[PDB]
Amino acid sequence: ELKLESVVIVSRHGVRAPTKATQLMQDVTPDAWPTWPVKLGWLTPRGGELIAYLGHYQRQRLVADGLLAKKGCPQSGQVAIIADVDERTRKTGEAFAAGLAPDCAITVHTQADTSSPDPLFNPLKTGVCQLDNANVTDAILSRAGGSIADFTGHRQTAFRELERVLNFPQSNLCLKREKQDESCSLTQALPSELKVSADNVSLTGAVSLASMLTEIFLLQQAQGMPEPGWGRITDSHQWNTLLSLHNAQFYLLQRTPEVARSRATPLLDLIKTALTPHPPQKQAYGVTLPTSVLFIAGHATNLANLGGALELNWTLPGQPDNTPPGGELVFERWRRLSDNSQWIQVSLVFQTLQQMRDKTPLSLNTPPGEVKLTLAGCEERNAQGMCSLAGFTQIVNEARIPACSL
C-alpha cells in the first residue's frame, strides 16, 4: 500500500559516563559511586557497541522496506550523518555508521569548529534567540501543578524510593541534620526552585539532583555494571519509580512548548528540509538533502524538545528513561501508491533496559522496542495514523520560532 521514501533519525547518544561528580552526590549516600572507564560525559565502548546494534537493525529494516541495498555500501550521500560536537555524539555517529554499513566509512559531519557549541542542537546556547522569561516561568510552573512544592508533594513515594537506594538516612547530609535534631528528606533538605534566564531553564535542589542520580543508576545498569544503585534496585517497579523523577524534570524543562519550540527550531528546519521532496542540494554541514537516510546524533533534550514542539507523546515499555541512550525519534516519508500522495510517520525506537543490560544483538527477529506516535495537531491523517506532508509542513511552520532559526 505504501512505499518508504525517506527516513530521518534523531538519536540520543549512547551509554555515557556521568557528566559531573559533585560534592552533593557524595554527601547524599554513605556508599561510594562506581567509577567509569572513560572521562566524564564520554561514550563508553559498550555504549558504542549498543548503538552499532541499532545501526545493524536499521540496515536490515531499511533493506526489507526497499530503501537501502542488501549488500554493498550506500552510494553518494544516500546515507548522511550529522553529529553534535561532543565526543559522545560524534562517537555515536561513528558507531551507528559502523552498524548500518560496516567498513563503508560514512562520514560523520559536524560543524566546522568542534571546540564550540553547535546551535543546531540548542540555539539558546549561542544566543541565536532568547526565551521569554515571564511566559516560560508561568508555563513551567503551571505544568508543575502550580508550584514546585506541588510538584514534589505529589512525588514523595518516588523521592523515598531514591532515598532508600542511596541509603540517604546514613549519609553525611542526613547525619549532620540528625545532629541538628532535624529529620532528613531529600526535598526538604534541598529545596527546589525554578531558575529562568534568557538562555536556559533549570531547577535547583532535590528535583535536579534526583533527575541526575536516577539517570546515573540507569546508565550503570545499561553499562553492565555489577550492582547498580549498590544492589538496592531489584525489580522493574523500582526502576520505573526512580526514573519517574528524571522524566518529570524533562516534562517541565524540555517538553514545555514555551521552551521546546525555540530549542527545537533548528532541528525542525533540518528535519523538514530532509523530508520534503526537492531537487537535491548541498546545504548545512556539506550534506546534500533530500536523501534516503539522515541520522542526527544529539541529546535527550533534543528528543524531548521535538516531542513537546510537535505534540508527540510517549512512554517506552520496558525502558524507564523516556529519552534513553540511543533512543531514536524516527521520521519517515511514505508514498501511498493508490494516489501517489505523501505521508509522514513518526515513531520512537529504543532498546529496552533489559536489551541494554544483556547487550542483546538486534535484528528483525529480535527488534528494539518501538512506539508508533501521532502528531496531536495533525488534521489530515491517513488510516495508518500518518500525517499528510502538507499537514506536517503546517505543523512545523506553526511550531517553529523564526527568531531561533540558523
Residue numbers in the entry: 5 to 410
What does the paper say about this structure?
The E. Coli periplasmic phytase, AppA, is a 1D-6-phytase (EC 3.1.3.2) and initial hydrolysis preferentially liberates the phosphate at the 1D-6-position on the inositol ring. HP2Ps catalyse the hydrolysis of phytate via an obligatory phosphohistidine intermediate.
While the wild-type enzyme has a strong preference for 1D-6-phytase activity, a marked reduction in stereospecificity was observed for a D304E variant, while a proton donor-less mutant (D304A) displayed exclusive 1D-1/3-phytase activity. Notably, KM was 5-fold lower than wild type for the proton donor-less AppA-HAT variant and the MINPP-like AppA-HAE double mutant. Turning first to variants bearing mutations at position 304, substitution of the proton donor residue with an alanine (AppA-HAT) leads to an increase in volume of specificity pockets A and B and a shift of the inhibitor (rmsd 0.5 Å for carbons of the inositol ring) towards pocket B. A modest shift is also observed in the conformations of the sidechains of pocket B residues, His250 and Phe254. Why for this variant the inhibitor binds with the 1D-6-sulfate in specificity pocket A rather than the 1D-1- or 1D-3-sulfate as suggested by the results of HPLC analysis is unclear; however, we note that a previous crystallographic study of a variant AppA resulted in a similar phenomenon.
